[PDB]
């Protein structure tokens, strides 16, 4: 039988096929088995609280109307134009903020039918998905970004989604993220929705994204240690040199306030304390105390008498050992906690 | 003799297709009273609240319900039928648009995110997923302790009040997805519903409205704005414990604190529209500018009265600092009592 | 007569209507009467020199072919799908940089026909329109933004536009702009174009936008007075304290240069002097002179002799009264001029 | 003859017209005569190295099939819907980075046919065109931005483009650019392309854009003179005041480094020396030398002896006349060169 | 007389032709061999942050369709109107690493269709593609990147459809095409990327461009203005030791400038969590400036008492540091530049 004629009798003019009617229409729900191949994964944005992904979305279901016997082939690879002629699930991504198909140089779609009327339908999609983030432990945080596959119009009695048993979520080889590590384990679960319009099938995959620490040492943690260590050189400087010790005390405090506000500059304006906020606040005290240390040294040494110049002397020889020690004690706590 | 039921293909053809004689260019009860459309929205997502562009984004399911006697059926016992959304093009449906929408789009991946359900008696349920960007004019007088009312107007474009009328559902008109959070605001449980009925030179058009109340969260602004400003004001005070002879130290300390406080002040408006009125944060930064600027003028006085090295004036200058060490922290504490209690 | 049949005889299959032919085709030009309702007005950008608007564009003309007698109704509200079946003007916005229709949840269009064949056609549009700006007096400037309604293909002998006599441009109640005031008076005029392709109808509406001064006091003028007043505290400071007076003189000059460049930072790079440039330049002199004042005080007082220390003393006691006075004299001039 | 019937017989059902076949199909190439009206000209971006333009693109050619005798009119203004029914050139802009048609409120298109079968076809387009820039002399530079009109599918034997003899490129009256001057002279030339697919017609127009100098005096050149003049006030300051002269020397150098990096901040990261880079580098030396001048004054005056204090004195009295003179000598050279 | 074009197209691929574009050439036979070549019209928007790059190309595909062979004209080939492309079968080539792509439709579809006597097809289409290009920034800004471009079939397995590059001149680049940040190396690697998914084995061919980053900007913007801050730190040693505020201020300002200089060098880059060549330089430049201040901490501390022995002991340090630091920094640059230019 010619392909042209075969398609016409299976789903075309002479077929009597109606794509407005689901498989097993009077019967039980259609079982759609999903699996995704992740071609690309990125644009993870804390500010807009979302992430971008390029996938092949594979759907599999049975349509008895599409079973065939005219060829011995186990399956037939059909031109995707025929996808408009057949029924197919109305899968949408519940947490999608934006999405598009791919049409260059032709519709990036795949349609394969099997002797027994099983269908394989792969489509390439780019999705931007919302990923609400808890930044409590930033930048030693770990985020769980999700992806929900849902039916828009079919209730649970007509259409049901399910993940493949074997290898539901595959990721392209050598796929890397510059800020995060994509953990091998993906959680799969049901998100089944109940609205006033009914109960709708929904299945979910959770990606775990562990943020890489390295950049923040280079950009945030090391250049702050360097400002705290700079505040300590004041104690080896002569007490008579007020402008020098004060200027050194001021500059370190103002650098540490811009350093502090600059650490939140690529983040959403969440109204809770983050792990980086703690560090910058504690680093603000250790620098701000260094100036108050000189306020004390300058004030007790007002009169030039030997008793007070040596009393003021005592403070610096203690502070030279106390602050580096106290800061070392703080880092022991801080890093071990996180 | 219980014969087989009518095929769906044939049934759709007789109800709204070729053989039906249905005309979607004609409303239900066309010569009669207006069509009553009952609306309800499910808020899937709520965000991108922008002070600068004075708007906000939302992803919703917009449910519309009305009666079309033409679509009543008796061929199946089912209370309702879930139809393929392709059939939405074949039937009449309201021309609802969002009056305050700055941008809007449908969702087509992986298919049109639409729902069509018809009932025995010809009632229709029509749900469509939409992303809308809606204008929300903001009063920033009390920023950042402000509370905004963002609205959403559902309106007919072509049907006057005698042909088409909108109305909110009595039970649960506006539902919000579970665990939906906004990082900057709290979305208040109470939503006001009201009529926005428009009169233009083209006629009187139905319009119904929902008002969301968004209370801004204070926390970030303590961390970013209020605490780092207290810290600059407290820094200005360490000048008074410093020896009066050290002019460059006290002056530098006085200058640096004033310039930090001007960049601090301009940086607080940097993510806001250029409104031409005084905000609550402008007050705080202006008062914080005085308490730091006065600290330098305090030393101008100490340096000036102590010109000659005589005991009488060095002690006179001494008097000022021992007063200022207690006065400014006290005066600033008195200001915060007022400021915070007012807002 | 049934509506279905009536539409079919007026503009459909059996009608013989041809939308490729204008009304009164062999006769005089079609008179299109325009009016706009401004739903929204904003995104006024100095940098890109344009502004955004959301309008209902109402067009009215007569089509004798669409006259009817089958119903007593003065007019009929038709489904907008019928707009494709009828002729209608080819109005475009000559100064539009971008524009779009509105399709959610259906085409935001209105079609109303009258017994005598008059048509009312309202369409919702979002337009971004170019508005060239003169920034000479910024930020005490006032801009005139325009909007040109023009025919693309019809010459003046076939199609003519005209504003409504009564209430051509309506604005939504309580519509506010945060940076400007939209003046009640709108100028209407003809922009009739002559190209090598012919003479084409064009009508224009000019909006007057007066910029609100308030922000610029808060952000620009007050924080500059504050830097000029800071430069003056140098004169009450002891002349022996060189580092203090110099540092105070320097910091005020550098703050005043960043203050000056920061005032143009949200503007296009026009190559002419603006009113804010004058103020920042004069404010730069009054601060820069304060440092040159100390250069003089430090230089004439080189030797510690009584004659020169008192000579240097003379300068500051003059400068303490002269600069505040001279600056007050400048503001009298400056503000009264603008 | 009725218009409806006339269009049917000329290009419609009964016409036998086939728009897949060019005019004079077995004969010589079709001569398309182009001319553009520039409605708008802007968004000239150094960073992305391109510019935006809104034009009416007029094309003229002869189609013997479209000649008519049924009306006395020299030409007929047809509804643009008829453009789909007729053959027309496949002109594209070879250097277009993005482009769009205009559809509000209808397709901004014009179709006019003449007795002898000549066609006039005007279409409104917005084009973003690439304009590679030489920034050697920035900001006293002059750029040549081009626009190439090319056929995509027709080789030179089937289709040839050519500019109008009279007035090929017209510009709207009072069209201004805030950063540049658009020079009256436009060069026209042939860009005829040879690819492995064949030899394709291409014609070009070159615009000359001379950058306006004014902004850069206000923003860049004057505020740098002001920092260089500030460095010179150090020489009138007492040599004993080390912190004052040093602070004044430092602040001027750091301001001059941010001033230098801030001058390239709106430019692409080209790897060659620009005219503004020279000026900022020379301005960096004259300020940096002023501090090295004090290093010398402070170092030779170590011991308080009269011989060295006067030796150090000598340097400043020379530097007070030398640097302003040397800088004046530099500007003579610099400005006269450019 | 010859056959009319209208009739000829109708018999070859139109109504009367019986052609079915849903069936590939040699459908029951071996795979279709598609020979690709690209002309690069433009190459740019290379972004480190988003880790991708833009390109405008003519994508030429060549294959044989026996159904399209003709004898009615002597012409070796026929240039057909691209509307006829919808009437014929053609490969489903897509760019595997494309992040975004579009066709060009102004003023008409930028497409080319040419058929030959023997049924060979030439099909050129203009495309703009944004392609992902993962970058290794270890040696930035003396780095060299390899950006790729993968041509792949979406639906045809290797037994039905195979891609292959042209032997002669597969990738042509427009004359005088320049990139402002990089040099595009003449040598392009071609290779096979043949993919195996759970849906099957799909043809894929690849071209690798080599982009060498130009050094010049970074001298002007990054390396020279940092040498200038390190040289500024050295003028402290020629300054009198008694002038504490001057030497300290000079020591501080240089350190803070060098921290903003350091953070500003990463400001146009993605937040990679590894050490780059510019990070090394800024860190070493931070030490040479930070040591200069610690040098004065030592000079100020050993000279506490005004005695001749210690003032001369402190004196010794500066006369060593005046020769040591410029020497030590020169020794560092010898190492640094030779490492990143002798490798
Ligand atoms: C056959 C369809 C649908 C329909 O159009 N009709 C006329 C009937 C008739 C009798 N009983 C049920 C129906 C519905 C349900 N079936 S369906 O299960 O194939 C179907 C088809 C399309 C759907 C849908 C359900 O929900 C979302 O869109
Ligand atoms: C039946 C329609 C509309 C129409 O087309 N015709 C021919 C008539 C005839 C007689 N009387 C009224 C009409 C109008 C009104 N009706 S309608 O109520 O169904 C209708 C239909 C569509 C509409 C509309 C009103 O306003 C918005 O767009
Ligand atoms: C009847 C139309 C137009 C046309 O298409 N034809 C065939 C003829 C035939 C005879 N005489 C004139 C015409 C022209 C002019 N008229 S029209 O005035 O209705 C018209 C119709 C469409 C137009 C237009 C003018 O300007 C551009 O778009
Ligand atoms: C007549 C067309 C084109 C064609 O379709 N056929 C069938 C033939 C037949 C015989 N000889 C030549 C052709 C070609 C050439 N002509 S054409 O010159 O009008 C033409 C038409 C369209 C074209 C084109 C050339 O190149 C670009 O796209
Ligand atoms: C002829 C097509 C396709 C088809 O539609 N039918 C009906 C049959 C019948 C018998 N054997 C195979 C087929 C398949 C395969 N062939 S095809 O090689 O021309 C083809 C055509 C289109 C394709 C495709 C393969 O891969 C996906 O897109
Ligand atoms: C769907 O199919 C899987 C096997 O493919 C089966 O295990 C599962 O139970 C099915 N679910 C339903 C509701 O039929
Ligand atoms: Zn897990
Ligand atoms: Zn309320
Ligand atoms: Zn006026
Ligand atoms: Zn020239
Ligand atoms: Zn190679």
SS3 annotation, E13-78: CCHHHCCCCCCCCCCCCCCEEEEEEEEEEEEEEEECCCCEEEEEEEEEEEEECHHHCCCCCCCCEE
The distance of Cα B317 from the centroid of its chain, to the nearest Å, equals 54
The tally of CA atoms less than 13 A away on the side-chain side of residue D230 is 37
Which residues of chain B have a CB within 8 Å of the CB of C3? 23, 25-26, 30
| Chain interruptions in chain D, by residue before each (C–N > 2.5 Å) | none
Strand C75-78, strand C109-114: pairing: antiparallel
Residue B293, preceding peptide bond in cis (omega within 30° of 0): no
- Rounded Cα–Cα distance for residues B85 and B96 (Å): 18
Query: Which residues does residue A203 pair with via DSSP β-bridges, in sequence order?
Result: A149, A190
Instruction: Pick the residue from chain E with its C-alpha nearest to D121.
Output: E107
Q: Which of A11, A130, A197, A275 to mutate to test the interface with B (most CBs of B within 10 A)?
A: A197
8 A C-beta contact, residue D312 and residue D239 = yes
Q: In this structure, which residue's CA is closest to atom 12 in ligand 4?
A: E78
What's the Cα-to-Cα distance from E172 to each of E43, E58, E150, rounded to whole Å? 12, 10, 16
List pocket residues of ligand 4, CB cut-off 6 Å: D 20-22, 25, 153-154, 158; E 5, 8-9, 73, 75, 78-81
What are residue A78's DSSP bridge partners? A111
Pocket test for ligand 3, best of C25, C61, C160 (most atoms within 8 A of CB): C25
Farthest-apart Cα atoms in chain E, separation? 119
Say whether domain A1-212 belongs to CATH 2.70.170.10: yes
**By C-alpha distance, which of E182, E177, E188 is closest to E142?**
E182
Identify the CATH class of E215-343. Answer: mainly alpha
Identify the H or E element spanning A245. helix A242-262
The CATH superfamily assigned to E1-214 is Neurotransmitter-gated ion-channel ligand-binding domain (2.70.170.10)
The DSSP result for A151-162, as a single string, is: EEEEETTTEEEE
CA distance linking residue C5 with residue B327, whole number of Å: 90
Q: What's the A145 CA to ligand 7 centre distance in angstroms?
A: 11
The CATH label, of 3.90.1170.50, 1.20.58.390, 2.60.40.10, 1.10.3720.10, for the domain at B218-343 is 1.20.58.390
- For residue A111, which atom of ligand 5 is closest to its CA? 27
Contacts of E137 (CB under 8 A, 6+ apart): E48, E143, E269, E270, E272, E274, E276
Say whether A99 and B82 touch across the interface (CB within 8 A).
no
Q: What is the gyration radius of the CA atoms in chain E, in angstroms?
A: 32
Shortest distance between the Cα of D101 and any Cα of chain E, in A, equals 7
Sign of CA dihedral D100, D105, D106, D110: negative
- Residue C27 DSSP code: S
Nearest 5°: CA angle at E215, between E331 and E326?
Answer: 20
- Give CA angle at A51 (A47, A55), nearest 5°: 170
B27 Cα nearest atom in ligand 2? 19
C240 to chain B: nearest residue by CA?
A: B247
Partners of chain A (3+ Cβ pairs below 8 A) = B, E
Q: How distant, in Å, are the alpha carbons of B76, D82, D83, E108 from that of D64? A: 63, 17, 16, 22
Burial of A194 (0-12, 13-18, 19+ CB in 10 A): exposed
Substitution candidate for ligand 1 out of B6, B8, B125 with most atoms within 8 A of CB: B8
Ligand 7 is an ion; its neighbours by CB within 5 Å are A 185
C308: alpha, beta or left, given left = phi > 0 and alpha = psi -120 to 50?
Answer: alpha
User: Do C77 and B157 make contact, defined as CB atoms within 8 angstroms?
Assistant: no
Ramachandran quadrant class, E58 (left: phi over 0; alpha: psi -120 to 50; beta: rest): beta
Pairing label, strands D30-45, D50-62: antiparallel
Query: What residues of D are in contact with residue E60 (Cβ under 8 Å)?
Result: 196-197
Query: CA angle D9-D12-D15, nearest 5°?
Result: 45
Nearest 10 degrees: Cα torsion A264, A268, A274, A280:
10
Residue E105 CB partners (closer than 8 Å, separation 6+): D101
Task: State the method.
Answer: X-ray
Q: Report the Cα–Cα distance between both ends of chain A, in Å, rounded.
A: 69
Q: What span, in angstroms and rounded, lies between the C-alpha atoms of C207 and A338?
A: 59
Q: Which ligand is nearest to the CA of E6?
A: 4
Residue holding tokens 């530099």?
Answer: D330
- Beta-carbon contacts below 8 Å between C and D: 153
Q: Hey, where are the domains in chain E?
A: 1-214, 215-343
Collect all residues with Cβ–Cβ distance below 8 Å to A71 and sequence separation of at least 6.
Answer: A1, A6
The neighbouring-strand residues paired with E112 are E124
Cβ neighbours of residue C289 closer than 8 Å, sequence gap 6 or more: C323
Subunits next to C (3 or more Cβ pairs <8 Å) are: B, D
Beta-carbon neighbour count of residue A287 at 10 Å? 25
Q: What are the φ/ψ torsions at residue E68 (nearest 5 degrees)?
A: -100, 5
- C86/C83 Cα distance (integer angstroms): 6
Q: Which residues line ligand 6 (CB under 6 A)?
A: A 31, 33, 160, 162
Tokens of A265: 């500059």
Per CATH, is B1-217 categorized as 1.10.3720.10? no
Closest CA to D50 of E267, E54, C271, E268: E54
Ligand 5, CB cutoff 6 Å, lining residues:
A 3, 6-7, 71, 73, 76-79; E 22-24, 27, 155-156, 160
Residues B39-65 as b or e (16 or more Cβ within 10 Å = b)? bbbbbbbbbebebeebbbbbbbbbbbb
Q: How far apart are CA B174 and CA B210, in angstroms?
A: 8
Which residues are CB-neighbours of B63 under 8 A, at least 6 positions away?
A: A196, A197, B39, B40, B41, B42, B125, B126, B127
**C-beta atoms of E107 and D127 within 8 A:** no
Report the CATH fold assignment for A213-338.
Methane Monooxygenase Hydroxylase; Chain G, domain 1 (1.20.58)
Angle at E191 between CA E187 and CA E194, to 5 degrees: 160
Structure token pair of residue C5? 């049949």
C-beta separation of D233 from C295 below 8 A: yes
State how far the Cα of C211 lies from the Cα of C142, in Å rounded to an integer: 6
- CA distance linking residue D249 with residue D251, whole number of Å: 6
Is the Cβ pair E293, A54 closer than 8 Å? no
CA distance C223 to C322: 21
Rg (CA), chain A: 32
């Amino acid at each position: 039988m010619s392909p042209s004629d075969f398609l016409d009798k299976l789903m075309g003019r002479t077929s009597g096929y109606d794509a407005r009617i689901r498989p097993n229409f009077k019967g039980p729900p259609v079982n759609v088995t999903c699996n995704i191949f992740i071609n690309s994964f990125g644009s993870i944005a804390e500010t807009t609280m979302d992430y971008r992904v390029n996938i092949f979305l594979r759907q599999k279901w049975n349509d008895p109307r599409l079973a065939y016997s005219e060829y011995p082939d186990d399956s037939l690879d059909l031109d995707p134009s025929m996808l408009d002629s057949i029924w197919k699930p109305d899968l949408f991504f519940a947490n999608e903020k934006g999405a598009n198909f791919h049409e260059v140089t032709t519709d990036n779609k795949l349609l394969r039918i099997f002797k027994n009327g099983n269908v394989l339908y792969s489509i390439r999609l780019t999705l931007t998905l919302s990923c609400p983030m808890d930044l409590k432990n930033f930048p030693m945080d770990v985020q769980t970004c999700i992806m929900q596959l849902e039916s828009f119009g079919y209730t649970m009695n007509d259409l049901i989604f399910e993940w493949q048993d074997e290898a539901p979520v595959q990721v392209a080889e050598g796929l890397t993220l510059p800020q995060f590590l994509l953990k091998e384990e993906k959680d799969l679960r049901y998100c089944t929705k109940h609205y006033n319009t009914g109960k709708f099938t929904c299945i979910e995959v959770r990606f775990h994204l562990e943020r890489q620490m390295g950049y923040y040492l280079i950009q945030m943690y090391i250049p702050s240690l360097l400002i705290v260590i700079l505040s300590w050189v004041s104690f080896w400087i002569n007490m008579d040199a007020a402008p020098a010790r004060v200027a050194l005390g001021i500059t370190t405090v103002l650098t540490m306030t811009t350093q502090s506000s600059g650490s939140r500059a690529s983040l959403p304006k969440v109204s809770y304390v983050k792990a980086i906020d703690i560090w910058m606040a504690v680093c603000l005290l250790f620098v701000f105390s260094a100036l108050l240390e000189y306020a004390a040294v300058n004030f007790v040494s007002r009169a030039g008498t030997k008793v007070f110049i040596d009393r003021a002397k005592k403070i610096d020889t203690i502070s030279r050992a106390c602050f580096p020690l106290a800061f070392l004690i703080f880092n022991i706590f801080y890093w071990v906690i996180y």
